[PDB]
Design an enzyme around this catalytic site. Structure first.
Site, PDB file in Angstrom:
ATOM      1  N   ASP A 199      13.545  87.379 -11.127  1.00  0.00           N
ATOM      2  CA  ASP A 199      13.637  88.140  -9.877  1.00  0.00           C
ATOM      3  C   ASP A 199      15.112  88.289  -9.547  1.00  0.00           C
ATOM      4  OD1 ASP A 199      11.069  88.396  -7.614  1.00  0.00           O
ATOM      5  OD2 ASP A 199      13.089  88.864  -6.959  1.00  0.00           O
ATOM      6  N   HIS A 257      14.711  88.180  -2.102  1.00  0.00           N
ATOM      7  CA  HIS A 257      13.392  88.507  -2.622  1.00  0.00           C
ATOM      8  C   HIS A 257      12.818  87.375  -3.482  1.00  0.00           C
ATOM      9  CE1 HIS A 257      10.517  90.897  -5.109  1.00  0.00           C
ATOM     10  NE2 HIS A 257      10.345  91.563  -3.985  1.00  0.00           N
ATOM     11  N   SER A 280       4.781  92.558  -4.629  1.00  0.00           N
ATOM     12  CA  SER A 280       5.812  91.530  -4.883  1.00  0.00           C
ATOM     13  C   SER A 280       5.403  90.172  -4.333  1.00  0.00           C
ATOM     14  CB  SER A 280       7.098  91.927  -4.128  1.00  0.00           C
ATOM     15  OG  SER A 280       7.819  92.932  -4.796  1.00  0.00           O
TER      16      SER A 280
END
Ligand code: CA
Ligand code: CA
Ligand code: CA
EC number: 3.4.21.121
Length: 593
Positions: free
Chosen positions: A76, A113, A334
């Site tokens: 990621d 994220h 996600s």
């Protein structure tokens, strides 16, 4: 006020409305993690959803099934490995591919994220912050998606299992994907190399589950220097079908859609025949719930920080989170992806030495048939011979010839961890995977023609001689057509079961984009575009399979464009083909046992 359970309570109701349903733990924020257990709480957003719409994992947690001994890789944008609610679960071997170090912590404030992803999977079970789905799983982070990463093939390999550090992960979390306006083949050297790696890592004795986001393109995508969305008249079909990212049809990926706290598809979720299951991703955490998780530490970093305010009540908040270590806005496929990674780690901790295919089988057979009455999305048009046809552009729930329920929106359904564990107790391993040789049909003659608003599909067939029970099917397709999103592409099994591989009015508008900015069109059509369907799980493979393609639209369409560099807004017009399309070839691969 939620005690531990042993293995062995008779009369245990493991369901979503049981009197035994509660989460152990002293994590101050856990009761606002609706994805762990949905009691209709708001997740610090304006309102709550509907109780029961969660991962139904409470019985795992109560019995001490927590992800112990399972290694999860988070590939990621970064991972703040020192985060007070992550560090205990970080094991050696992370790699920062921007700095060369062992510490994938981001230095950019918006790069939160992967840290948010990691918390959903494995926030530590203690007296701070949240509780992970699998709070005893061990994490590594690989920051392939940092803004300054070169996204090198060598580093993708390193992170996805092809190095000492990462090979012994049993779960690979890929909260990422590609959006496209022109179709891509899956046969590039880099793609096939990653597919070979994923095959090796999945099927070995210590086998690893690759988990992959379907995409967040139901309405809008970013591609080709723009943000694009449809406007005007049209059916409510996804702009991004989940078969568009070539990686999403590689089989080794378990591709997931996002579910919100109301128990329906998250507004933005990509969908398609290749979705395996639905998992929790929520909406935005503003008006309705999203995913309460670990943020970049401090009020100067992350999605929870002073400079990036939110209406989510956890963010401004000196009472509940004084150092802004947590956030309430994480979302997307996600988030469905780590929800799945966490569920998978729970199962693997209880039943190590079941194969990845066996874990898939358990997850599929135990999934909940949420939103059971959602309707198919129909496309109506006057056909070329004057008859109005009304055909499915996207299915609702449908039962295949083996009795398995499937939908392109929810796959086999919403994860039910408790029930997967109930099934696992007496699960008999599936026979070994058989990958049947590709069967390629080179189409010729007048059978190749795809008429404009066809009264019947153009069909091409191939017979599978081998008896087999199907798990998944892959197709590659080549055709010419001057306006790709007019095409509906379906696969029909020997039993007569249908699966929409590509829904029409998708984001493949690049031919129109090219005409407008270049003055000519680079894309003739599909070239070895790969798609996958899970619709046929359990069916007999032997018999004739049929590829059916239909042009279902001759009207003009408009697409709104936002230039990402210059925020300038423009309008793209897709004009009808005006020469008929042509099927060139297709290939079929049956994966089963
Ligand atoms: Ca915690
Ligand atoms: Ca923060
Ligand atoms: Ca057309």
């Amino acid at each position: 006020g939620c005690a531990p359970l042993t293995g062995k309570e008779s009369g245990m109701d493991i369901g979503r409305s049981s009197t035994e349903r509660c989460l152990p733990g002293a994590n101050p924020l856990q009761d606002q993690q609706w994805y762990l257990l949905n009691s209709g709480q708001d997740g610090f957003s304006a309102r709550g959803g509907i109780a029961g719409n969660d991962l139904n994992l409470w019985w795992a947690h109560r019995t001490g099934v927590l992800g112990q001994g399972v290694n999860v890789a988070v590939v990621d944008d970064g991972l703040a490995i020192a985060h007070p609610d992550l560090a205990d679960n970080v094991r050696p071997g992370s790699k920062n591919v921007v700095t060369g170090s062992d510490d994938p912590t981001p230095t950019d404030p918006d790069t939160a994220h992967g840290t948010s992803v990691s918390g959903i999977i494995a926030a530590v079970d203690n007296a701070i912050g949240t509780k992970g789905i699998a709070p005893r799983a061990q994490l590594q982070g690989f920051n392939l998606l940092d803004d300054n990463s070169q996204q090198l093939q060598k580093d993708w390999l390193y992170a996805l299992g092809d190095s000492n550090a990462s090979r012994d992960n049993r779960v690979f979390n890929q909260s990422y994907g590609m959006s496209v306006v022109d179709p891509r083949s899956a046969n590039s050297l880099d793609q096939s190399q990653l597919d070979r790696l994923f095959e090796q890592q999945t099927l070995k004795a210590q086998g690893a589950a690759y988990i992959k986001a379907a995409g967040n393109g139901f309405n809008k995508i970013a591609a080709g220097g723009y943000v694009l969305n449809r406007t005007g008249n049209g059916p409510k079909l996804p702009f991004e079908n989940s078969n568009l990212d070539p990686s999403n049809s590689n089989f080794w990926n378990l591709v997931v859609s996002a579910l919100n706290a109301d128990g329906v598809r998250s507004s933005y979720s990509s969908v398609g025949s290749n979705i395996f299951l639905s998992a929790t991703g929520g909406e935005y955490g503003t008006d309705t719930p999203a995913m309460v998780t670990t943020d970049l530490p401090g009020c100067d970093m992350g999605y929870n920080r002073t400079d990036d305010p939110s209406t989510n009540r956890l963010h401004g908040n000196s009472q509940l989170d004084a150092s802004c270590d947590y956030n309430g806005v994480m979302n997307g496929t996600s988030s469905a992806t780590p929800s799945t990674s966490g569920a998978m780690a729970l199962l693997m901790s209880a039943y190590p030495d079941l194969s990845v295919r066996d874990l898939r089988d358990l997850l599929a057979r135990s999934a909940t048939r949420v939103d059971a009455k959602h309707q198919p999305v129909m496309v109506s048009y006057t056909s070329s011979t004057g008859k109005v046809r009304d055909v499915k552009g996207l299915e609702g729930w449908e039962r295949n010839a083996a009795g398995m329920w499937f939908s392109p929106t929810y796959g086999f359904g919403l994860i039910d961890v408790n029930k997967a564990l109930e099934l696992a107790a007496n699960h008999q391993p599936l026979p070994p995977l058989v990958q049947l040789p590709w069967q390629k049909i080179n189409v010729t003659g007048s059978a190749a023609a795809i008429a404009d608003v066809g009264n019947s599909p153009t069909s091409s067939t191939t017979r599978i001689a081998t008896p087999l029970t199907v798990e998944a099917v892959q197709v590659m397709v080549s055709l010419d057509h001057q306006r790709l999103p007019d095409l509906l592409i379906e696969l029909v099994s020997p039993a007569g079961t249908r699966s929409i591989l590509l829904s029409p009015f998708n984001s493949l508008v690049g031919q129109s984009l090219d005409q407008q900015q270049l003055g000519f069109v680079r894309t003739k059509g599909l070239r070895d575009m790969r798609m996958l369907s899970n619709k046929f799980y359990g069916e007999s493979a032997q018999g004739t399979w049929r590829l059916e393609v239909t042009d279902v639209a001759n009207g003009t369409r408009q697409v709104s464009l936002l230039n990402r560099e210059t925020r300038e807004r423009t309008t793209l017009t897709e004009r009808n083909n005006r020469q008929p399309g042509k099927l060139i070839s297709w290939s079929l691969r049956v994966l089963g046992h």
